[PDB]
């Protein structure tokens, strides 16, 4: 997250870190046994880390649970990043409380102008690299589809939305991928892609979760 603020420990209780020896992507806890992330974060050997603030220090609220099954969306296209969504089943159920909690799925899609909360452990610089140990947060609005398509001609599908600031300076970034965009208490986006980070006229692009609720629910019911 570029241009954000320190969230505070366990203030984003649905945020998870995906770990394969190191943090590599975010995700969101959607019930006690399932996480949603970005398909471009797929790899084998995932440990899901819940209850984290500092990802390099054991602070006392963590739960570390291996994945038993990963399911990339049937229609994910790695060249265009269309359908950039993946479900991860935990080997055992997490223990839910105030500091580790699920986020609800949306019943309707959010409109442009809605303010959302984006969070992650990704790069904090638009030039150069500095990776934080503690969770960072950013409040940002959903942009109109027309603004989004203007910024990225030929690249925005119906399964994507833009959020952020056309003036630059505030955005998600590398290492935030897979993490949540929460608006009015519902998961509306997944950190997916952008051109650089926090550049003028290049806002972040997010997977539009409301298009996937049926697939999510059906998949969880059968796996």
Q: Which is nearer to Ca ion, 133 or 167 (CB)?
A: 133
Is 174 annotated in some ligand binding site?
yes
DSSP-assigned letters across all residues of the chain: -BS-EE--TTSSTTEEEEESSSEEEEEEEEETTEEEE-GGG--SS-EEEES-SSTTS--S--EEEEEEEEEE-TT--TTT-TT--EEEEESS----SSSS---BPPSSPPPTT-EEEEEES----SSS----SS-EEEEEEBPPHHHHHHHSTTT--TTEEEES-TT-S-B--TT-TT-EEEETTEEEEEEEE-SSSS-TT--EEEEEGGGGHHHHHHHHHH-
Q: How many chain residues touch Ca ion (CB under 5 A)?
A: 3
Here's the x/- map for Ca ion, 34-73, by CB under 5 A: it reads as ------------------x-x----x--------------
Gapped junctions in the chain, after residues (C–N > 2.5 Å):
none
Q: Which is nearer to Ca ion, 53 or 84 (CB)?
A: 53
Is 57 annotated in some ligand binding site?
yes
Is 54 annotated in some ligand binding site?
yes
Q: Which is nearer to Ca ion, 31 or 54 (CB)?
A: 54
Q: Where in the sequence numbering do the catalytic residues fall?
A: 40, 84, 177
Is 175 annotated in some ligand binding site?
yes
How far CA 167 is from CA of 140, 200, 203, in Å, comes to 12, 5, 9
Q: Which is nearer to Ca ion, 121 or 193 (CB)?
A: 121
Minimum distance of Ca ion from residue 48's CB (angstroms): 13
Here's the x/- map for Ca ion, 180-219, by CB under 5 A: it reads as ----------------------------------------
Minimum distance of Ca ion from residue 62's CB (angstroms): 5
Is 167 annotated in some ligand binding site?
no
Annotated binding site: 52, 54, 57, 62, 171-172, 174-175, 177
| Interface contacts to Ca ion, rule CB under 5 A | 52, 54, 59
Binding residue positions for substrate: 171-172, 174-175, 177
Known binding site for Ca(2+): residues? 52, 54, 57, 62
């Amino acid at each position: 997250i570029v241009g954000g603020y320190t969230c505070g420990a366990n203030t984003v209780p649905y945020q998870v870190s995906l770990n394969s020896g190191y943090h590599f992507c975010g995700g969101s806890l959607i019930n006690s046994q399932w996480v949603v992330s970005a398909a471009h974060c797929y790899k084998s050997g995932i440990q899901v880390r819940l209850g984290e603030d500092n990802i390099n220090v054991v602070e006392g609220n963590e739960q570390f649970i291996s994945a038993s099954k990963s399911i990339v969306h049937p229609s994910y296209n790695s060249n265009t990043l269309n359908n950039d969504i993946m479900l991860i089943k935990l080997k055992s159920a997490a223990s839910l409380n105030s500091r580790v909690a699920s986020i609800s799925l949306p019943t309707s899609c959010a409109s442009a102008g809605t303010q959302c909360l984006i969070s992650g452990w990704g790069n904090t610089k638009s030039s150069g690299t500095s990776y934080p140990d503690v969770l960072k947060c950013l409040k940002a609005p959903i942009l109109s589809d027309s603004s989004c398509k203007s910024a990225y001609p030929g690249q925005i599908t119906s399964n994507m939305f833009c959020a952020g600031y056309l003036e630059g300076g505030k955005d998600s970034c590398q290492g935030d991928s897979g993490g949540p965009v929460v608006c009015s208490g519902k998961l509306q986006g997944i950190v997916s892609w952008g051109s650089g980070c926090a550049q003028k006229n290049k806002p972040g692009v997010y997977t539009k979760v409301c298009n996937y609720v049926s697939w999510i629910k059906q998949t969880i019911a059968s796996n």
